[PDB]
Each structure stands twice: as structure tokens, then as C-alpha cells.
């Protein structure tokens, strides 16, 4: 199938924040591909990295890399190392990414030509896809996305186009996808944490019937971290859902460790420093504990990173999760429950309790793969009539 159907996408919006001060170049990112393999992600969303004199159309060149990020040969070296490790590279081409308006305020035709020419240039350079954010600020965005998708997909079927929106409205999303029907789109459709399990259920099912169960993306934002919208108690629950919904789950760097930009005083909400160990944030040593880092969470089976790796492994290998056949049945007020299946492979049952109270819930007995909370027998069959969920608990079960 398509490569972006086979696992999660990983957005690295800031190279210097992801790696450390001064090491924010393409050559340095080569040394993090092993870690990204451990997350079992199938594609990186990189950049933007092009020359962009802020709010100046004439002095913005989508075909030239800002020297602060490396050279074109550094980029080619990064592409080959990622290809040798089965990781694909998506290049973000949002033109005025250093200004307040991402698409400038003038010369819509010149800006669109810059993007169109950048598509053809970087496709010849060997990139696997592109991302364009802040689509709502682009006049006739639906038409431009159609022209850009045709060019990207006419070069090769294995090339992807990702559009991003701040919108959470369904008609505004459906009209952007109209002339495309193949565009992977990210939005704030699920951004509201306060929604109950019944409402999240309604959001997912209503979107899939309005889109005719077409392949889509699943995420809480077009660029932001999960902690920008969710409290800590809901992080594990939402990671179970995003990895088990029909489509491509898209995350931002740090989501795997529950990175919280507010936890680091002064850090930008958009590009916080990635916490590898206790030396990652030397500004305020007391602000970072070991349980907040990649090094510390990698030693903890109960950590959010260990759950991310387990769910990502299941998403990229089980055929029921790789293909988009999905049915969610009514099962309670604060419950979101659904089954995932494909032909005759192993089927998966997902039960999500969004509420603060224990709520009650196909074979009679199924084997529990994991839970978002400790204290259960993983690898010992449970039953789906006396199923009882603790607050904010999510269950993933197996049955043939």
C-alpha cells in the first residue's frame, strides 16, 4: 500500500529545538534517525528550511536552504540515510513561515507559483511529500490544493501532499477536500479536550460518513503538541485512540514523552526544547526531572514513551490497523468503543473512558493486549460483559 498508510507521521517543526542549540542542521538530524526508528514512525515532516526574508515575497526562495540549517548536499545526505532506514521525508513549504501571515498579504499568484515550482524542484531532488500549513489564509485554497495534488501525485503515486488548517468546522474541511479526494489534511477537528466520549464518538463517525470513509489523517492539530489541548490525564487515552483510528496518525516531536512547553518557563509553545536527558535544559535545572526525559522514560515500561512505542509497533504491523475498516457501536455516555478488522486477520477492540467515573461496556472472551493504566493481566483473556473501566482508562483487546 501507500507508505503513509503504514504508520505514524512525525512533525519536526524546529530543528534547533529538536536537537539542541547550534546543532539544528540537517546533518545533525541524521544522528537522530535511529531514535525515530525506535518510534517506528514511517515519515518525518521537516521544516520549513527555505530562505524566507520575513514578509518579503521577492526575497523568499523556496528552492534554497537557509544556511543555518545546512546545504543542499546535507539535505541529500539526510534523504539517503532516511531511505536506508525506511523513513520518508516530508518537506514543509509554507512560504512566509517567519512572518505573521504564512502566505503573505500580497501577490497571491506569485506565491502560488513559488510553491508550485518548489513542488517540481524538490520532487526531482528526491523528497517523498510536502506539507502546507495555514491553508485558511490562502485565497482559493481548494483550487491551489487541487493543482498541487495533481502535480505531486502525477510525478509518482508514492508522493504525498499534506494540508493544514486551524479550522475545526466540518463544512470548511469538506470543501477543502472536495476537488482532491486524496489530500491528507490535518485540522483542529478533535482539538477540544472537554468533549465527552459520546461527543468524540460523534466527531469521528460523522466525519467518516461525510467523507465516505475515505482515508484521512487523525490528529489534534496541524502543528501543535498534544499538551497544547490535553491535560496529562488524557494523554495516554488519546494516543491509544489516534493510533487505532482508521487513517494516518500525525504527531509533533515531543508527543511521545508528553512534552509540555508550559513546564519550561520562557520556552515557545510552538518549538519547545526536546528533553533527551537532564542536560537538555540547562537554563533551569530544577524544571526538568528524569521522568520528563527520553532517557528516563525509556527505562520505564509504564512511561508514555513505552506506550507510544508499543502502539506504534502495533499500528505498523497488524493488518487490521493498517487498513481502514472501522465500526463504532453505541456503548455508553462517556465511552468510545469500536472494532478494527481486515478480512481474516487479528481483530482489535478499543474501549475508551473519557470520564472521571467507572463506566460499563463479537466474542464473549477476548485477550487484552494492553491498558493505558497499570494493574491488569496483559496476555490473559478478559470478557466483554463484565468489562469495567477505571477513570481515563483505555483498553486494547485481541481476538481472532
Amino acid at each position, epitope marked *: 500500500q501507500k507508505w503513509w498508510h503504514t504508520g505514524a507521521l512525525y512533525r519536526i517543526g524546529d530543528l534547533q529545538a529538536f536537537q539542541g542549540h547550534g546543532a539544528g542542521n540537517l546533518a545533525g538530524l541524521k544522528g537522530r534517525l535511529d531514535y525515530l526508528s525506535s518510534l517506528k514512525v514511517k515519515g518525518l515532516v521537516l521544516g520549513p528550511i527555505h530562505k524566507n526574508q520575513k514578509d518579503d515575497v521577492a526575497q523568499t526562495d523556496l528552492l534554497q536552504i537557509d544556511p543555518n540549517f545546512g546545504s543542499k548536499e546535507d539535505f541529500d545526505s539526510l534523504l539517503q540515510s532516511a531511505k536506508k532506514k525506511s523513513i520518508r521525508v516530508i518537506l514543509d513549504l509554507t512560504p512566509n513561515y517567519r512572518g505573521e501571515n504564512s502566505w503573505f498579504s500580497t501577490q497571491v499568484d506569485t506565491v502560488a507559483t513559488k510553491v508550485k515550482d518548489a513542488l517540481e524542484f524538490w520532487l526531482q531532488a528526491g523528497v517523498d511529500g510536502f506539507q502546507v500549513r495555514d491553508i485558511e489564509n490562502l485565497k482559493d485554497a481548494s483550487s491551489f490544493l487541487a493543482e498541487w495534488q495533481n502535480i505531486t501525485k502525477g510525478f509518482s503515486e508514492d508522493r504525498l501532499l499534506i494540508a493544514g488548517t486551524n479550522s475545526s468546522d466540518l463544512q470548511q474541511i469538506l470543501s477543502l477536500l472536495e476537488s482532491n479526494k486524496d489530500l491528507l489534511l490535518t485540522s483542529s477537528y478533535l482539538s477540544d479536550s472537554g468533549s465527552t466520549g459520546e461527543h468524540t464518538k460523534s466527531l469521528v463517525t460523522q466525519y467518516l460518513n461525510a467523507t465516505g470513509n475515505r482515508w484521512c489523517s487523525w490528529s489534534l492539530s496541524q502543528a501543535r503538541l498534544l499538551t497544547s489541548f490535553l491535560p496529562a490525564q488524557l494523554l495516554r487515552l488519546y494516543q491509544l485512540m489516534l493510533f487505532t483510528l482508521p487513517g494516518t496518525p500525525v504527531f509533533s516531536y515531543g508527543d511521545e514523552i508528553g512534552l509540555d512547553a508550559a513546564a519550561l518557563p520562557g520556552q*515557545p509553545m510552538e518549538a519547545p526544547v526536546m528533553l533527551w536527558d537532564e542536560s537538555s535544559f540547562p537554563d533551569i535545572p530544577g524544571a526538568v526531572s528524569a521522568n520528563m526525559t527520553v532517557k528516563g522514560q525509556s527505562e520505564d515500561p509504564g512511561s508514555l514513551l513505552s506506550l507510544f512505542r508499543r502502539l506504534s509497533d502495533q499500528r505498523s504491523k497488524e493488518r487490521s490497523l493498517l487498513h481502514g475498516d472501522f465500526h463504532a457501536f453505541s456503548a455508553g455516555p462517556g465511552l468510545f468503543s469500536y472494532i478494527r478488522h481486515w478480512d481474516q486477520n487479528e481483530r482489535f477492540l478499543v474501549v475508551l473512558n473519557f470520564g472521571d467515573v467507572g463506566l460499563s461496556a463479537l466474542p464473549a472472551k477476548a485477550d487484552l493486549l494492553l491498558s493505558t493504566q497499570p494493574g491488569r493481566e496483559e496476555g490473559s483473556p478478559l470478557e466483554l460483559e463484565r468489562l469495567k473501566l477505571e477513570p481515563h482508562e483505555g483498553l486494547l483487546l485481541r481476538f481472532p
Partner: antibody
Amino acid sequence: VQLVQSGAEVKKPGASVKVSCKASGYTFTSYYMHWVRQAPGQGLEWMGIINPSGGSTSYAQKFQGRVTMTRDTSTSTVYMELSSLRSEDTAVYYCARGYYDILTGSRPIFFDIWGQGTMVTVS
Amino acid sequence: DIVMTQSPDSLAVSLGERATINCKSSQSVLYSSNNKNYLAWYQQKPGQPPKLLIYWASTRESGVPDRFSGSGSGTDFTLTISSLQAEDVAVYYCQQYYNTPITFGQGTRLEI
């Protein structure tokens, strides 16, 4: 290279006060801006931090809910606003620039450039 | 939150004599990663903002006379003045920046 704050202000209980802090002589968006207040004859108390490149803030819990820090990059000015003023808020309010370690690219929170100060008196 | 305690609260020392101010923190401010102590010393004269004297517990800011020196590690720190001079009458504060919130000492007054 200096920081110049607005003039002294007198306010009634329950009112709000907004102190400005204009920067000059350096790249404004590269240095974090902190606020420290000092009651007459008392010690120093750190209020919070604003980063001019993005506007993200972080306030001490003692002031969470009453303090708001904003920035204007065009005028290179930082604003601090305190609401629900009481008698304990009578103090001199300083804006201070956060140190930048050129060697390590880190910003440890000690203050090399201070503002003149602004006396706020509450009835 | 880290509490800073200075000692003494007031200090009288004649001219050209050794002045010693101590600062204790309820929690070690020694960062094991870079082996640095996140402590600073300030000097404040009446009607003026505090002025940064020492940081990293013992590194002196450029422009501060050689007589000022900072020492200590972990939880105990000392600001020492070799030979007291006339323009040194001020209140001296220590400040930790190991963690947030940033906290100061209560301050030591230095008179002749």
C-alpha cells in the same frame, strides 16, 4: 543600552496598574524579560518572565490570576499589569533583562540589566 | 520552593577590614550536569536597582573590583570583601536560580 520604565502611579484597592518597560541598545527579541518587585524596606520578590520572541510567559504561583505580561516588538516595550490591587502590592516594580550565556546558548535567570523602577502606591 | 537565608541581617565593619556575608539555601543549587552552582550576589544602594556582583557562586561580573569574591558550594555560600571601602555601604542579596520561582535572600545591610 538601558531599560526605562514608566512613571510612578497611585491606585485604589481593587484597581489595576500597567507598568511599561522600554528597551534600547540591544536586540529586543533575544533576551528574556523578568519582573521583580520590592516592598519598602523589604526584600526582593520575583514575579514572572516573558519571552519577547513569541510572547510565552511563566508566572509565580503567588501572582497567577492577577499578573499579565505582554510585549510590543515594534516599540521594543514590555508591559506588566497587576489587578485586584491590595496593600501588599505597594512596592517598587523593576523590569530586568535575563542573562544570556554566549558560550552555551543558555539563559540562566540572573539579571544583568535593570530598569529604573516604578513606585506603585495602593491606599 | 527554595528558601534563601542570609546571615547576619546587619553587619558593621570598619574600613579596610574583612566583611563576610553568608547565604544558606534549603536545597542544593549544585547542578550535577555542568558542576555549576546556580547562585548570584547583588548589591543595592538606596534609590537604585540591584547591581549584579557575582554569578555561578564565584564568577565576578566585569567591572566589579577585585576585593569582592564569592565562595561556597552545594547549600552554603559566602560573599567576602577583602578591604571595606566607603562606596560599599549597601544591602547585599543572594539569589538562587536553580529552579522556579526565583527566590532571594532577605538581605544583609553593610555599614561602617
